Design a protein around this ligand. Sequence first.
Ligand SMILES: Nc1ncnc2c1ncn2[C@@H]1O[C@H](COP(=O)(O)OP(=O)(O)OP(=O)(O)O)[C@@H](O)[C@H]1O
Lengths: 179, 48, 48, 404, 360
Amino acid sequence: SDKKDAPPLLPSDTGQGYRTVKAKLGSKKVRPWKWMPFTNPARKDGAMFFHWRRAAEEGKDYPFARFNKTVQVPVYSEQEYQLYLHDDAWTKAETDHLFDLSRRFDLRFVVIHDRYDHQQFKKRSVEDLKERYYHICAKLANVRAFDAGHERRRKEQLERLYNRTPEQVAEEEYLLQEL
Amino acid sequence: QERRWKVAAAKKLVRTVVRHHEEKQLREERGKKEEQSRLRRIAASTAR
Amino acid sequence: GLGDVRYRYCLTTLTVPQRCIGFARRRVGRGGRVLLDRAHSDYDSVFH
Amino acid sequence: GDEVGALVFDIGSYTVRAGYAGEDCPKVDFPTAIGMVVEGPTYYIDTNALRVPRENMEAISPLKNGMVEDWDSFQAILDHTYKMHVKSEASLHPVLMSEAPWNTRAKREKLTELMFEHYNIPAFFLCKTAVLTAFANGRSTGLILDSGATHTTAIPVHDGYVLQQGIVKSPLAGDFITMQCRELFQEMNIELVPPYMIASKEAVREGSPANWKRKEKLPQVTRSWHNYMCNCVIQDFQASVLQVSDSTYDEQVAAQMPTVHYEFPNGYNCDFGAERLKIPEGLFDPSNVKGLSGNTMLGVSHVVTTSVGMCDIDIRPGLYGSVIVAGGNTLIQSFTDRLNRELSQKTPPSMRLKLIANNTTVERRFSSWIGGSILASLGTFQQMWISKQEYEEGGKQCVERKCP
Amino acid sequence: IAALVVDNGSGMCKAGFAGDDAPRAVFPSIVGRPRDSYVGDEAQSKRGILTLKYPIEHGIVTNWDDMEKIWHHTFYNELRVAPEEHPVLLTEAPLNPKANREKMTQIMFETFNTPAMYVAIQAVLSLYASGRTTGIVMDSGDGVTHTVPIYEGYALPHAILRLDLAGRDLTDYLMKILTERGYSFTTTAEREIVRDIKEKLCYVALDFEQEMATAASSSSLEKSYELPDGQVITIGNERFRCPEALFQPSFLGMESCGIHETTFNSIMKCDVDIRKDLYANTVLSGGTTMYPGIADRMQKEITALAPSTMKIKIIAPPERKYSVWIGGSILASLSTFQQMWISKQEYDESGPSIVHRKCF
Ligand SMILES: Nc1ncnc2c1ncn2[C@@H]1O[C@H](COP(=O)(O)OP(=O)(O)OP(=O)(O)O)[C@@H](O)[C@H]1O
């Protein structure tokens, strides 16, 4: 945002005094703007909203539709789960719930786990979901044809380092640099 | 940034308006004083 | 420094008000208007 | 061009903020409370109809800590908002309402039902108040400390989504300080003349009991209404007098620092010394307080530590780089710096910890609404709104399918 | 060349050139649709064949075709100036919706082909006329009253309070009291004669019960007034009971707080630090805020209401009714303001939303 500094500088035409630009403005006229209804092609349901546009671009298209990209999701209903997307600890219900939720939260694993329903299904950590998603993607790749454990070691190493009591933090960090 | 620009612009504009009013009042006071001194100098020129 | 990737203010000089404004970076606000942001750098006095 | 005719409603615990998308500040800010009279909600709405004394009129709040307590009173609040402050019939304007993350999902469903069915707005959306407060500052990785009159809470947000289970709730809020100053009034015997009777200002020097007269025309007022107005008076007192110590409260320092002066509505005036510094320490350490001092009470620094800890380290470093303080209670003088030192002690400074600067009344209260204004005019966001034709099934299924 | 300062009141339209001390053209904001279209100056004379509409209610534009016609009249008849050759400064009530400001910009640039435009808040312009860096503005305009706190020229939108009584409904209440007197004034012409009676006679009393006692004890309050029909009437007790309604809206029958109470409310809504400075600088603007003695009644009222420790000063210059137009003229005459105009290029590229990017 800012750090409490001078105000922004904005474009202006009527610097000087509209005696300079009297001619440059009088000789031209504006393109007629209109409040026009539009429907974004990115909308699965064809709802319509208003906004200001030039009345020569009316109803053309919504430039932000190109931001509507989505990441893929695997598919299985009756037999692909048993044949290819096999599992022995996760039910079809839990896998489908996790997959729909991952689409909800666009494979943002942390908030995915945050939502992961702990009372419709048994508890588990983020890296379990991450590695299971990797496994399902690998299986899909095979039919359609770095290490989670070290990440757990990560979480525990950071937890130990930070939970370290302040005096030990200072002493060890001294010991850290001395050698 | 727009809020910052608007606060700074309102400050500058209101303070320029206050400046306009103060300069105007000082100009009227100076005009009265100058008229008094001009009449005094005309009196001095005639007496002289 | 900490190497923040977004706060890339830099020395700039305008053309009509031809002077070194100091640390300023360019941005597009609503309506497609290119705005220069600014810092109140401690170098502010050096730019005389 | 990214804007639509969007209205951003941000109903917190104290005041309702209604304004148009793209607006720098909320258009209107009038209190959550609302008047009542015998027959349904025969009524009185904003700071102009909620203050004139009346024959046995009673004041209630359709809200409580942000969750709706009476949907009919909420509906009439909204009706008056649209009728006068925004003065545009609601049938055309997309709306996005802010709800506290801990507000029930069923209440979100019922709110959507009321909105769409009755008011027949053509679009809708929901996004949490903490989410919107972090929205205002442009930060994906942020930690929010919201503290209004009725509740104080700390909530982290990453990727713009709340860590829904990472919610910390602490009644140590504006009402906590208000009760503390109330017991202060009682202990040193302030008689709280309500401003609405006083008609004379025979003021007196320091400490003396000021003289005054009550207007003969005054009719009887229900106790709830008088309670509300004197509560507003003591809220003004909270704003004016309270100050927070930089470090842990000390008696000798608190006495040494110069006292401050407050005058009451009737002309009674008094000077405060160490008590004003002591009071916010109650928020920062509930133990010293009367009654509301059990170990169950959790202070600000403990609240932030608890909220930060409950989330794993994949985002905790992000929380380190930005601590965002919003809501009313954060405006107590020198509260933010005290919180900053408090966290610098509680949270190991071993890694990168920064605050995020925001001071003024506009920036703290309305940062919840400012984020909503930022969203509503956002170009990509226009696809997200719940349309009426969508609503036909969305109010039930997609009010959750869409708004996390 | 000169900038056009058109102030769109709630029943009174003021126009003139930037730098002029007073609004040259003042005409009521009436528009009539025959039973062609005519605006106040001719509309007020053409009533018999005409039905009169107001395009501004409570300072917010009601419908845009009538306001279009008001601006057409303003320029081409009252000012005779070409809109294509002069910059235009428009003033709109505080808390005007975004759509209304955008439509104002659209109407100006599209229909009237103005080269440069600006929309400024009426209260801030009244402050400019007063000439104070910070202040609280009480503008009892033509159709609505607004209490606007201003810090460093920046209007604080959250604290602005609207109370929906002002000169017009006050005149209606005067018509009520005047029927109570035993007279009768119902027609539009009779309503305007009551308007003239209000302008000539009434005042804001320093003390209500005291003045009731005085009126009962003394007949001196009675003054004679001459009607267009030729007869003569006397107005006494009514001279202040109607203005008294400002501070006790219950007299109107409206169920809201009075002017001084609403000013207290607005002051409270502002940040505590600047409350002292707002107290020191209270500005009375608007058309119906220029009753005699109203300033002193306000002074006593908010001395009583406000903490006795803070000096309340009431600023009500003798021509406060035009203070908004004078502020507009001062603003348009500034060299520093010239950089704030909205040019044709900026509307052409950014559209009506440009009014919000640089013109608050
Ligand atoms: N100067 C002040 N400093 C601190 N608190 C203040 C001040 N002035 C008023 N307050 C009180 O602080 C609170 C203002 O915040 P408010 O209750 O409006 O927050 P909110 O945005 O609605 O959030 P929340 O969901 O926490 O209630 C109210 O209790 C108000 O009485």
